[PDB]
């Protein structure tokens, strides 16, 4: 079920949503919110400041060009 | 091509998917998986625990309120 | 407004996009780009290398199994 709304809401309601985009997907919006968990299966780039409210885990963190595991 | 499915799958299959949402997008699902790379062009907030399986790179990491580049 | 395109673009244009996926969402594409901010309300896993162009903030960072707040 895909509802389009006067007032400007686009609502997709189902069990699973599967997007297969051969080349790319672009989400052009001021803010995107995921209510659950997220997995990224290749890499991540982030331009702006990031806050993690809980602990992060990483094999190493390269800070201002310097190793953290080996500093 | 957008398929809606008895059994509850919503399948969007194309070359590129472009979402232009003037105000916001909200994805309310227990788990979202991206098979490829992801870029976030403003900021990131994450509530729960994060694991990075590979090295991360950052100009600085502010840990429990303390600089890592300058500690 | 949802446009499907010869040439292979799927364009969704509205004020807000709301996805309610009872079980999961999967985005199978080489690259997904968010132009704005992103919040993840549970956890994040990332397989590949991550770059944060700006400072990150975390209560702690567990690097190669070691605490950063308490090392
Ligand atoms: Fe040290
Ligand atoms: Fe130190
Ligand atoms: Fe130290
Ligand atoms: Pt910013
Ligand atoms: Pt959690
Ligand atoms: Pt990679």
From Swiss-Prot, chains A, B, C:
Report the superkingdom from the record: Viruses
Upregulation: Expressed in the late phase of the viral replicative cycle. Expression of late genes is activated by the viral late transcription activator C.
Q: What happens when the gene is disrupted?
A: No tail is synthesized.
Where is this protein localized, as stated in its record? Virion; Host cytoplasm
Summarize where Fe cation binds, as residue positions.
71
**Oligomer status and interactors:** Homotrimer. Part of a complex composed of three DNA circularization protein N, three baseplate hub protein gp44 and three sub-complex wedge (made of two copies of each baseplate protein gp46, gp47 and gp48) that forms the baseplate.
Quoted from the entry, the domain comment is:
The C-terminus is a needlelike shaped homotrimer consisting of an intertwined beta-sheet, a triple beta-helix and a metal-binding region.
Reported function: Component of the baseplate that forms a central needlelike spike used to puncture the host cell membrane for tube insertion during virus entry. Probably involved in baseplate and tail assembly. Serves as the distal plug of tail tube channel and might regulate the process of the phage DNA and protein ejection into the host cell.
* UniProt protein name: Baseplate puncturing device gp45
Taxonomic lineage per UniProt? Viruses, Duplodnaviria, Heunggongvirae, Uroviricota, Caudoviricetes
């Amino acid at each position: 079920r895909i509802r389009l709304t006067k007032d400007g809401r686009c609502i997709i309601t189902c069990k699973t949503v599967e997007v297969y985009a051969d080349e790319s997907m672009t989400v052009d919006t001021p803010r995107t919110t995921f209510t659950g968990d997220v997995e990224i299966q290749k890499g991540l780039g982030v331009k702006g400041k990031s806050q993690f409210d809980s602990n992060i885990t990483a094999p190493d963190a390269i800070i201002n060009g310097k190793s953290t595991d080996k500093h």
